[PDB]
Design a protein around this ligand. Structure first.
Ligand SMILES: CC(=O)N[C@@H]1[C@@H](O)[C@H](O[C@@H]2O[C@H](CO[C@H]3O[C@H](CO)[C@@H](O)[C@H](O)[C@@H]3O[C@@H]3O[C@H](CO)[C@@H](O[C@@H]4O[C@H](CO)[C@H](O)[C@H](O)[C@H]4O)[C@H](O)[C@H]3NC(C)=O)[C@@H](O)[C@H](O[C@H]3O[C@H](CO)[C@@H](O)[C@H](O)[C@@H]3O[C@@H]3O[C@H](CO)[C@@H](O[C@@H]4O[C@H](CO)[C@H](O)[C@H](O)[C@H]4O)[C@H](O)[C@H]3NC(C)=O)[C@@H]2O)[C@@H](CO)O[C@H]1O
Ligand SMILES: [Ca+2]
Ligand code: NI
Length: 934
């Protein structure tokens, strides 16, 4: 009986039986048993082809806290009847299990477990209410590495039509083949599609398309909605590649959160806080599914588990009790906390599930034996479970008020009750947690009794409710006023949240007579369409944080309601109330003081108080002083003010201490003192910074003491290094505009004196220069300071620039350069040095620094700055100046009269090059006149 002629065995099972052939390939007596079993395996395989899948028992739709479980096929006593220690059966799962997940592995194709499942387990579990679900890995929807059916790439190509063929083939193979109740797709890192044992991106993308086609067949958006379409994952929502396009097609999301990591989250010591927490996890998924579809999972103790697969989600065997492999108490377990857990927002959860439910009741191997790979504990044997833990957990949830149905004692009005259920949910627990939008626009609503049940409602739209006549605290959500979360957590951890007060939109309540919003600390009235509240007779908005100044939207909503009430019953101290306001002072988005001009005097200004100031309400009223706020307290409505008599300018004002400052003079010198001295004529740029950010400024201003000067630029930034002893990679960092961090080595080179040869970016007129000592970057730096330095330009009159450019290193001698300024440290602590330069024009430069330290003395220069203004053709213009001066001495060639006119023009040009306001257009005009006169 060859194995190639068996017909009914799957090619996989045949690939197995022929490998077992190779072993003992010629042993006379073992070549028998392998064929004799490959046959008996074929007899079984053909009994699976001819079994009769029972007719589907119709089942009640899902409802209430659900409890699922993953039964490991290889622990069913029919998986491999030769292993007589496997005693459990999936059919024995009690009615408390709403979802029994077939979790497949190690059970042979030809196993008769599949005939016990189809013809006995499904009928039994179905008659009691338990749905049976097949679990398949992510990779079954794409790729070819263990992709099961999808390995056949010709029958199911990766195309629009191929993906449909694969989706229908999946549902047909794994759902309908045994008349199962639904399909579960597990997306983890372990199940991700691979090829060559490499994560396949083209494979992951195909799986999204195939997942969508499967959803067009089963699940809430498929042709057959009786079958469930479930997804179980370990990814956070922001890392699940299939939730965005997949979520609308699934009935339930099962997040696997085993162990204290799933519950508490992971620690991240850079934040000093936890991440991937239980609350953070669902908040991510709350964008894609309703909370009633969310199900959190734990794990029972799997036999012979090793490091990485030990979760301790159920109680552990006591170290003394060495014979007791069993523990069925839920008290103090992670699973029992998971059953009672409810998110803080949205609503209550679908339920919980357990992995390896065939191990229900088995205690956990003590933590101390985790690393002993071969230690066989009492809890590592196989037991028959009566599923006591599963029953105990299910009843815990089933007996939780959170899942009590919303009834007429919450909302006596039917029209309101039907709308709450349409938009919020159907559980009392959903009122304590729903943080979305409730739109009550059906005018049949006769009463708003019950709305006070809402604790976290984000927005409430009351539209066209003609039968409503009163609105006050008793018939509005409880979060109308600020408050903190009151739902206590049942989980473990290592402050409560703020409840954003509700946004109240009201429009078309023509029957509304009284509006009482007092004592809620409301920030605005936005949402009130006062032009529609036509029957309003009594209004009270006192004791809030409203800015009722004229011109505001708040005042106009108020004026409108006051006008309506003034045609119905009259405005008076009883029908209209508004006082006791405490508007919230905010920082402005912008500030108006963009320039401050002072005379040159020996005074002192506080830059903060003179440029950055002012508090603004959320209505846009700017208060810039204690004087404006008294004009504000002076605003009167019906003869009296609306600001609380106890709310002073000190309370309303926003504080500007902690705000830093970055002053920059016209030579690009920098300070950081709020105090400035007007003793020196100079022009400064001032940037202010909030404590929360020191890179994006909140306000820029321009202080001008005396005659305004144009601000210089760092013409050296971006300069090209072409020489110098100094390390060219590091050299170029002196032109990089920032000082740097003290992690980066910026040492120029080995010996104690180092040059840098460089060319400026664009032409320019240079008027200043500055080099920073190392103390500018880190004040505690151990790199000694520069003792002596020289800045030089290239002797272009005598030497050829082209010779320099062809062999720039040859020219590292001061004979080829001209010195324009030398620095010599006198021995005093200096963070930087700066000095003027005489309208230099050269494009090519050479600097040297010297710490004077015999050896091991490294020149460290954060940044070298050659400052000035941009000026195209500085060469020619400055060349023209020096010509008129020469001519003016040749008093024999030119008459005195010719020279006096030329002198005025040469003088005029020099004046424009050294003017405080640099004007390139005037310069060119003068230098053009001068060259023309020559
Ligand atoms: C998705 C999900 O549910 N989330 C995770 C769980 O996945 C996770 O549970 C584990 O699941 C393992 C099985 O998962 C596989 O199936 C699911 C569903 O189809 C897939 O989603 C998943 O990716 C796994 O896929 C399977 O992978 C294998 C390996 O590749 C495929 O077959 C092999 O594939 C390779 C290529 O990679 C190659 O081609 C090979 O030839 C091929 O055989 C397989 O095809 C693929 N699925 C299919 C059908 O497509 C469980 O195994 C795991 O449980 C084992 O380990 C725990 C450790 O604590 C034990 O407690 C537990 O009892 C079990 O032990 C194993 O028992 C069998 C029973 O006999 C032992 O077999 C023996 O092995 C011997 C050699 O060691 C001899 O060969 C002997 O003849 C043989 O009988 C086996 O050795 C035991 N192994 C161990 C480790 O003890 C676990 O339940 C859980 C984990 O916490 O978390 C969930 O959230
Ligand atoms: Ca630098
Ligand atoms: Ni062990």
């Amino acid at each position: 009986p060859s194995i190639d002629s068996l017909h009914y065995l799957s090619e996989n099972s045949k690939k197995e039986f022929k490998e077992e052939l190779s072993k003992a390939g010629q042993e006379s007596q073992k070549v028998k048993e392998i064929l004799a079993k490959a046959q008996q395996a074929d007899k079984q395989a053909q009994e699976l082809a001819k079994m009769k899948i029972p007719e589907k028992i119709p089942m009640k739709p899902l409802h209430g806290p659900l409890y699922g479980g993953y039964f490991r096929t290889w622990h069913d006593k029919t998986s491999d009847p030769t292993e007589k220690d496997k005693v459990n059966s999936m059919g024995e799962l009690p009615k408390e299990v709403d979802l029994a997940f077939i979790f497949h592995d190690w059970t042979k194709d030809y196993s008769l477990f599949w005939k016990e499942l189809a013809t006995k387990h499904v009928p039994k579990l179905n008659k009691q209410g338990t749905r049976v679900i097949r679990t398949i890995p992510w990779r079954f929807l794409a790729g070819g590495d263990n992709s099961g059916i999808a390995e056949d790439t010709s029958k199911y190509p990766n195309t629009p039509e191929g993906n449909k063929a694969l989706a229908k083939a999946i549902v047909d193979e794994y759902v309908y083949k045994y008349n199962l109740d639904g399909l579960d797709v597990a997306v983890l890192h372990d199940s991700i599609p691979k090829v060559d044992k490499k994560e396949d991106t083209a494979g992951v993308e195909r799986s999204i398309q195939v997942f969508e086609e499967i959803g067009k067949l089963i699940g809430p958006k498929g042709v057959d909605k009786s079958r469930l379409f479930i997804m179980d994952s370990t990814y956070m929502a922001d890392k699940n590649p299939l939730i965005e396009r997949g979520a609308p097609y699934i009935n339930l999301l099962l997040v696997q959160v085993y162990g204290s990591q799933g519950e508490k989250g992971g620690w991240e010591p850079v934040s000093n806080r936890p991440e991937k927490t239980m609350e953070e996890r669902w908040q991510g998924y709350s964008k894609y599914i309703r909370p009633e579809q969310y199900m959190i999972g734990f794990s029972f103790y799997e036999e012979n588990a090793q490091e990485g697969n030990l979760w301790y989600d159920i109680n552990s065997r006591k170290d003394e009790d060495k014979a007791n492999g069993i523990n069925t108490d839920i008290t103090g377990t992670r699973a029992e906390r998971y059953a009672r857990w409810q998110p803080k927002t949205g609503g209550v959860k679908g339920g919980i599930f357990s992995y390896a439910i065939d191990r229900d009741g088995v205690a956990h191997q003590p933590k101390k034996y985790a690393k002993q790979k071969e230690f066989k504990d009492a809890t590592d044997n196989i037991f028959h479970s009566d599923y006591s833990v599963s029953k105990a957990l299910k009843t815990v949830m089933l007996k939780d008020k959170s899942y009590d149905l919303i009834d007429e004692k919450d909302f006596p009005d039917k029209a309101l009750r039907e709308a709450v259920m349409a938009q919020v949910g159907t559980r009392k627990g959903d009122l304590e947690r729903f943080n979305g939008t409730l739109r009550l626009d059906n005018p049949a609503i006769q009463s708003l009794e019950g709305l006070n049940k809402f604790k976290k409602l984000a927005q409430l739209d009351l539209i066209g409710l003609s039968r409503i006549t009163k609105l006050d605290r008793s018939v509005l959500p409880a979060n109308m006023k600020p408050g903190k979360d009151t739902l206590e957590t049942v989980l473990e951890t290592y402050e409560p949240a703020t409840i954003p007060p509700v946004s109240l939109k009201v429009s078309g309540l023509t029957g509304l007579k009284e509006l009482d919003l007092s004592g809620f600390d409301r920030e605005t009235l936005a949402g009130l369409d006062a032009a529609t509240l036509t029957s309003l007779e009594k209004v009270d908005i006192s004791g809030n944080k409203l800015d009722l100044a004229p011109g505001t939207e708040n005042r106009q909503i108020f004026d409108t309601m006051l006008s309506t009430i003034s045609n119905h019953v009259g405005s008076n101290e009883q029908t209209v109330k508004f006082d006791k306001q405490k508007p919230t002072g905010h920082y402005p988005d912008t500030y108006g003081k963009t320039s401050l001009r002072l005379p040159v005097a020996n005074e002192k200004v506080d830059l903060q108080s003179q440029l950055l100031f002012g508090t603004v309400t959320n209505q846009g009223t700017l208060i810039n002083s204690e004087a404006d706020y008294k004009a504000y307290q002076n605003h009167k409505i019906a003869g009296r003010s609306f600001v609380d008599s106890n709310y002073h300018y000190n309370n309303f004002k926003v504080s500007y201490e902690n705000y830093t400052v970055k002053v920059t003079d016209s030579t690009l010198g920098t300070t950081t003192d709020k105090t400035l001295a007007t003793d020196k004529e100079e022009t400064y740029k001032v940037d202010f910074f909030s404590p929360a950010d020191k890179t994006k400024a909140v306000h820029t201003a321009k202080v001008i003491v005396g005659d305004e000067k144009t601000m210089m630029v760092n013409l050296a930034e971006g300069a090209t290094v072409i020489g110098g002893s100094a390390d060219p990679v590091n050299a170029r960092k002196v032109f990089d505009g920032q000082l740097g961090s003290e992690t980066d080595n910026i040492s120029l080179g080995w010996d104690s004196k180092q040059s840098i040869i460089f060319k400026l970016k664009e032409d320019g007129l240079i008027k200043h220069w500055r080099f920073f000592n190392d103390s500018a970057r880190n004040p505690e730096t151990t790199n000694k300071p520069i003792q002596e330095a020289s800045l030089q330009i290239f002797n272009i009159k005598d030497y050829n620039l082209d010779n320099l450019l062809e062999n720039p290193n040859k020219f590292d001698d001061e004979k080829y350069w001209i010195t324009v300024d030398t620095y010599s440290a006198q021995g005093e602590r200096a963070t930087a040095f700066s000095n003027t330069l005489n309208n230099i024009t050269s494009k090519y430069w050479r600097v040297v620094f010297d710490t004077k330290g015999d050896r091991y003395s490294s020149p460290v220069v954060p940044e070298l700055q050659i400052l000035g203004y941009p000026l195209p053709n500085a060469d020619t213009i400055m060349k023209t100046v020096t010509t008129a001066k020469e001519l003016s001495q040749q008093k024999d060639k030119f008459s005195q009269k010719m020279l006096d006119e030329l002198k005025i023009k040469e003088m005029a040009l020099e004046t424009s090059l050294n003017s405080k306001i640099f004007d390139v257009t005037a310069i060119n005009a003068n230098a053009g006149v001068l060259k023309d006169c020559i």
